[PDB]
Amino acid sequence: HPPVVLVPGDLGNQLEAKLDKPTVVHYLCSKKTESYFTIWLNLELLLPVIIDCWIDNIRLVYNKTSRATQFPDGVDVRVPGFGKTFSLEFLDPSKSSVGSYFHTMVESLVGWGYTRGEDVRGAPYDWRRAPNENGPYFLALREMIEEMYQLYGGPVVLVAHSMGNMYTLYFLQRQPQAWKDKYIRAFVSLGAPWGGVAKTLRVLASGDNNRIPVIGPLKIREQQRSAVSTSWLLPYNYTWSPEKVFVQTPTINYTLRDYRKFFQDIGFEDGWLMRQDTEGLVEATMPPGVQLHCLYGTGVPTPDSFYYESFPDRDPKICFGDGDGTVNLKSALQCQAWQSRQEHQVLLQELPGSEHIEMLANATTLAYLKRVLLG
Numbered sequence: 001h002p003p004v005v006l007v008p009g010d011l012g013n014q015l016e017a018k019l020d021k022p023t024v025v026h027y028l029c030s031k032k033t034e035s036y037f038t039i040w041l042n043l044e045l046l047l048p049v050i051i052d053c054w055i056d057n058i059r060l061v062y063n064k065t066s067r068a069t070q071f072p073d074g075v076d077v078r079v080p081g082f083g084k085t086f087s088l089e090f091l092d093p094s095k096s097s098v099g100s101y102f103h104t105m106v107e108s109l110v111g112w113g114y115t116r117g118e119d120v121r122g123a124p125y126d127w128r129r130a131p132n133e134n135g136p137y138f139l140a141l142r143e144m145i146e147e148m149y150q151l152y153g154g155p156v157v158l159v160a161h162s163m164g165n166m167y168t169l170y171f172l173q174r175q176p177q178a179w180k181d182k183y184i185r186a187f188v189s190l191g192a193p194w195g196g197v198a199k200t201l202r203v204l205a206s207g208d209n210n211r212i213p214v215i216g217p218l219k220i221r222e223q224q225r226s227a228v229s230t231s232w233l234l235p236y237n238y239t240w241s242p243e244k245v246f247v248q249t250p251t252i253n254y255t256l257r258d259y260r261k262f263f264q265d266i267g268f269e270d271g272w273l274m275r276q277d278t279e280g281l282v283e284a285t286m287p288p289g290v291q292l293h294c295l296y297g298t299g300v301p302t303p304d305s306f307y308y309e310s311f312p313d314r315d316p317k318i319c320f321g322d323g324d325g326t327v328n329l330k331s332a333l334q335c336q337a338w339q340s341r342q343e344h345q346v347l348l349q350e351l352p353g354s355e356h357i358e359m360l361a362n363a364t365t366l367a368y369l370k371r372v373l374l375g
């Protein structure tokens, strides 16, 4: 069985922070921590009031002159568990059941004879940022893959979920063909948002608290806007129709060609700058150049377009299309398009009735993985 590298999506791996802040927004916020502590996921930090301290620490500060993000003053952040799997398996380490993500898949791999940190390793990253600001991650990824090839005597299978697929595609596009041919056995793509997703618009406009219902959407919106990864996942014209209307308000429409207006109108000009920085990172048409298995969920209502009665401080009415609940079905066209441009094999696999996250622990998904690894 070949070695395996797991790549998480947005919000998909733990993050740690250390504090020595000059000042804070409220007296009850900690100025200093003695060591690094879990910033994501920690449910205790997401309660009302305390949320303001958390936002103050986890937000990214955009420098308009340098066109780059910085951490808040006195705040440092690291990605734990690179080369291990604990940070991908459970999001909140203290809070077992509720935070289960990659756990089920990893347990199955172990059942088939794999070993944590050895045959199977995770590649977590700072998912708040785009690939442009995770250069070190990609260096470590390349080196880890080479090490696993040497140790275990064979090329690696990449298994990526959601945004992890875009990160890994960027990575693969930048490696020479000879390297990919030697070191990569296959790339298993799970729920990949090729060409962005509709839900991005709602998040940016009015906030999205589906997971965190105890907190108001307009409060959490502040943090969500700050993450470059959010703006990076706005719909792209090669997958969606250039004329498709995503957002309707009482005064105006918004298509994918109206992002500048959108950002100005919602009062977040930084987001336009973020989008300009990142929209050109991944070459739309260039395939990864390796054996690809594209798994996508269907039959789950997925937000397609939005009507705002009041813009942008009031929650919108939502029209639904097909997909996995998060990633729109229309994303799977890119895999379809790559199939016709094939040196390497491209296999498409529908997962009817499988939700975006549930697919990672689904028996059918695991059975397909078995096929790839042992066949």
Ligand SMILES: *[C@@H]1O[C@H](CO)[C@@H](O[C@@H]2O[C@H](CO)[C@@H](O[C@@H]3O[C@H](CO)[C@@H](O)[C@H](O)[C@@H]3O)[C@H](O)[C@H]2NC(C)=O)[C@H](O)[C@H]1NC(C)=O
Pocket (backbone or CB within 6 Å): 063, 064, 065, 066, 070
């Ligand atoms: C955003 O990032 C930019 C670029 O890194 C920062 O630019 C700052 O600009 C000042 C001058 O306006 C820099 O000071 C000058 O440095 C040059 C050497 O290149 C020297 O010849 C001058 O005498 C002067 O000292 C400053 O170094 C630089 N600030 C930095 C690097 O922190 C800008 O400050 C950043 N903005 C924020 C809010 O972080």
Ligand SMILES: *[C@@H]1O[C@H](CO)[C@@H](O)[C@H](O)[C@H]1NC(C)=O
Pocket (backbone or CB within 6 Å): 237, 238, 242
């Ligand atoms: C999509 O956007 C890019 C960048 O603006 C542009 O080069 C390309 O022509 C666009 N596709 C269209 C207009 O169909």
Ligand SMILES: *[C@@H]1O[C@H](CO)[C@@H](O)[C@H](O)[C@H]1NC(C)=O
Pocket (backbone or CB within 6 Å): 245, 248, 249, 250, 251, 252, 253
């Ligand atoms: C958006 O465009 C469509 C098609 O041109 C039009 O029917 C509609 O009136 C527009 N919506 C708004 C809110 O202006």
Ligand SMILES: *[C@@H]1O[C@H](CO)[C@@H](O)[C@H](O)[C@H]1NC(C)=O
Pocket (backbone or CB within 6 Å): 351, 352, 353, 354, 355, 358, 359, 361, 362, 363, 364
């Ligand atoms: C797994 O997928 C099957 C069919 O693909 C679906 O019927 C089922 O609801 C899913 N179950 C879980 C636990 O994800």
